[PDB]
Amino acid sequence: ASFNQMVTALERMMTSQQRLLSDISEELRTPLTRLQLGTALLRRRSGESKELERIETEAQRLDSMINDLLVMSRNQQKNALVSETIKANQLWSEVLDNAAFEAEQMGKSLTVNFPPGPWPLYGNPNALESALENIVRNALRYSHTKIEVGFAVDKDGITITVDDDGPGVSPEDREQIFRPFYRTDEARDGTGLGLAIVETAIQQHRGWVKAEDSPLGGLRLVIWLPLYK
Amino acid sequence: ASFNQMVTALERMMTSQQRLLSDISEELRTPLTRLQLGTALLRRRSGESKELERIETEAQRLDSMINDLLVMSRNQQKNALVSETIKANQLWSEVLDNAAFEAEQMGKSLTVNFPPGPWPLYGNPNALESALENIVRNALRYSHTKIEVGFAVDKDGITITVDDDGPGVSPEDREQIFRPFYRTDTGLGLAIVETAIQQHRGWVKAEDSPLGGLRLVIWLPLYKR
Ligand SMILES: Nc1ncnc2c1ncn2[C@@H]1O[C@H](COP(=O)(O)OP(=O)(O)O)[C@@H](O)[C@H]1O
Numbered sequence A: 001a002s003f004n005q006m007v008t009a010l011e012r013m014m015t016s017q018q019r020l021l022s023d024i025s026e027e028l029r030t031p032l033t034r035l036q037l038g039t040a041l042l043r044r045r046s047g048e049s050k051e052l053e054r055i056e057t058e059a060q061r062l063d064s065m066i067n068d069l070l071v072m073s074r075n076q077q078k079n080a081l082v083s084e085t086i087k088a089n090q091l092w093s094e095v096l097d098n099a100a101f102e103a104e105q106m107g108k109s110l111t112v113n114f115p116p117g118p119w120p121l122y123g124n125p126n127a128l129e130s131a132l133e134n135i136v137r138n139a140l141r142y143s144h145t146k147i148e149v150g151f152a153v154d155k156d157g158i159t160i161t162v163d164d165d166g167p168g169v170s171p172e173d174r175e176q177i178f179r180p181f182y183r184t185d186e187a188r189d190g191t192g193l194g195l196a197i198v199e200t201a202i203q204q205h206r207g208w209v210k211a212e213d214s215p216l217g218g219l220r221l222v223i224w225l226p227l228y229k
Numbered sequence B: 001a002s003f004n005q006m007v008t009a010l011e012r013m014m015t016s017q018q019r020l021l022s023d024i025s026e027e028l029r030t031p032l033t034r035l036q037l038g039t040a041l042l043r044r045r046s047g048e049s050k051e052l053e054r055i056e057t058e059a060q061r062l063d064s065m066i067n068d069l070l071v072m073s074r075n076q077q078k079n080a081l082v083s084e085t086i087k088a089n090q091l092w093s094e095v096l097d098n099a100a101f102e103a104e105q106m107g108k109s110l111t112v113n114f115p116p117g118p119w120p121l122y123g124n125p126n127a128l129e130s131a132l133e134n135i136v137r138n139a140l141r142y143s144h145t146k147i148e149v150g151f152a153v154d155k156d157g158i159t160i161t162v163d164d165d166g167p168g169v170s171p172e173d174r175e176q177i178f179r180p181f182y183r184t185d186t187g188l189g190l191a192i193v194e195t196a197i198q199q200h201r202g203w204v205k206a207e208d209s210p211l212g213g214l215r216l217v218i219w220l221p222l223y224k225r
C-alpha cells in the first residue's frame, strides 16, 4: 500500500530526527561552558554586579536544561529499537506488576480496573512500555493513597486511563503539562521532560495523550493507541 | 483504514519530534534571549569589554546551533515528503564536474575511477546530491594533492567511495565524525550526509584510505519498479 510506504518513510525520518536531537544536546555543552567561563571571569575580574548575577542565573537555567536533555537523549537512542507487532497484555503486564509492588511499599494501592487483553499493537515495545511506566510513576509519586489503571478496546484502538487521588493539576496547567521542562509550582517546591517524552512517543505511534481531572480527585492521564490491523 | 484516519496517523508521525524540537528550542531560547539582551545592555554601557564580547559570541553560537537543528529537522520532513525517481549520472555528474574544476584551481587532482551510470534511485535529489557534495568538498579541503571518486553498481545498489591523500582521521574519531558540529582541531557536513543516506535506506562508513587520508563509503539501494 501507499500508506505502508508513507509509514516506513516517516519511521526512517523519526530515526534521523532522534539522532539529531541527541547529538546537538552533547554539542550545546561546548559554547555553554565557554560562556560560563566568561561569567566566571567578570565575577572577580570586575565587581559583583546584580546585572552579572542576572546573566549568571540565565546561564544556570540554560545549563540545567542542557543537562536534562543529555539525560533524556541518552535513552531515546539506546532504548530505540525496530518496530514490531506486540500484544497489549505482553507489553504492559510487567509494568503493572512492578507498579503494584512499588505502591504496596509506599502503603498505597494500585488497582487494574480492566486488564490489557491480547490486543495487537505495532511499534517500539520499549518506547510504549516506558510511556505507561512514566505515567504510572507520576501517579505513584503524587497520589495520596490510590492509583487506578484501566484498559478499554474497540475496532480502532486501545484507551489506557491512569487515575490517582492526589492533588491534580489545574485546568490551565493541564494544557502545558506535556511541554518539555514544564513543572507545576507544587512539584517545583525532576526535569519536566517525562510527559514530553510520553506525548512524542505516543504521537510517533500514531496515537494521542490527554490530561484530565480524575474522578478519584487527582490527575487522569488518557493514552490512545491504534489497533494493528 | 479511512483516508482521514490515514492522514491523521501520518500527521502525528510527521510532526511528533518536530514539535518536541520546536518546544525544547523555545524553552532554551527564553533564558538565552534574556542573556543576549542582558549582555547587549552591558555592552552599550561599556563598549571596551573582551569578556562581555566572548559571552555574546558564545550565546550567538548557542542560538545558531539551536537554529541549525530546527532547519535540519525541517529538511528531514522535506526528505520524507518529496521523493522522485532519479538516475545516478543525472544526480551526481554536475557535482563531480564542479569538484574536478575546484581541485584544478587548488593545484590538486580529482580522478573518477569509475563514473556513475544511468542507475535508478528513489528519494530527494537535493538531499542525495548534497550527500556526495559534502563528502567531496571535505576531500578537496583536507587532501594534500589528490582526490579519487569511484562508483560501483549491482542489482541491490550503488557504492560510492571517496578517497584523499590528506591527513585522515584517527580510528577513535572516525566513530564520532558523523555527529553535528563535530571538529578535530560548521561541522554539519557529515551529519547532513549520514541522516540523508540513512533516510534513503542506505549506509555511510569512514575508513582509512589506501591514498593515506580518509575514505568515505556511501551505499544506497537501487530503485526497483
Ligand atoms: N499525577 C500527577 N499528579 C499531579 N501532578 C502531576 C502528575 N503527573 C505530573 N504532574 C505534574 O506535571 C509536571 C510535568 O510532569 P513530568 O513531565 O512527568 O515531569 P518530571 O519528569 O519532572 O517528573 C510535574 O512536574 C508535576 O508538576
Ligand SMILES: Nc1ncnc2c1ncn2[C@@H]1O[C@H](COP(=O)(O)OP(=O)(O)O)[C@@H](O)[C@H]1O
Pocket: B134, B138, B139, B142, B143, B164, B166, B167, B168, B169, B177, B178, B181, B182, B183, B184, B185, B186, B187, B188, B189, B190, B191, B213, B214
Ligand atoms: N577528508 C577528511 N580528512 C580529514 N578530516 C576530515 C575529512 N573530512 C572530514 N574531516 C573531519 O571531520 C569533521 C566533520 O566533517 P564535516 O561535518 O563535513 O564538517 P565541515 O562543516 O567543516 O565540512 C571535520 O570538521 C574534519 O575535522
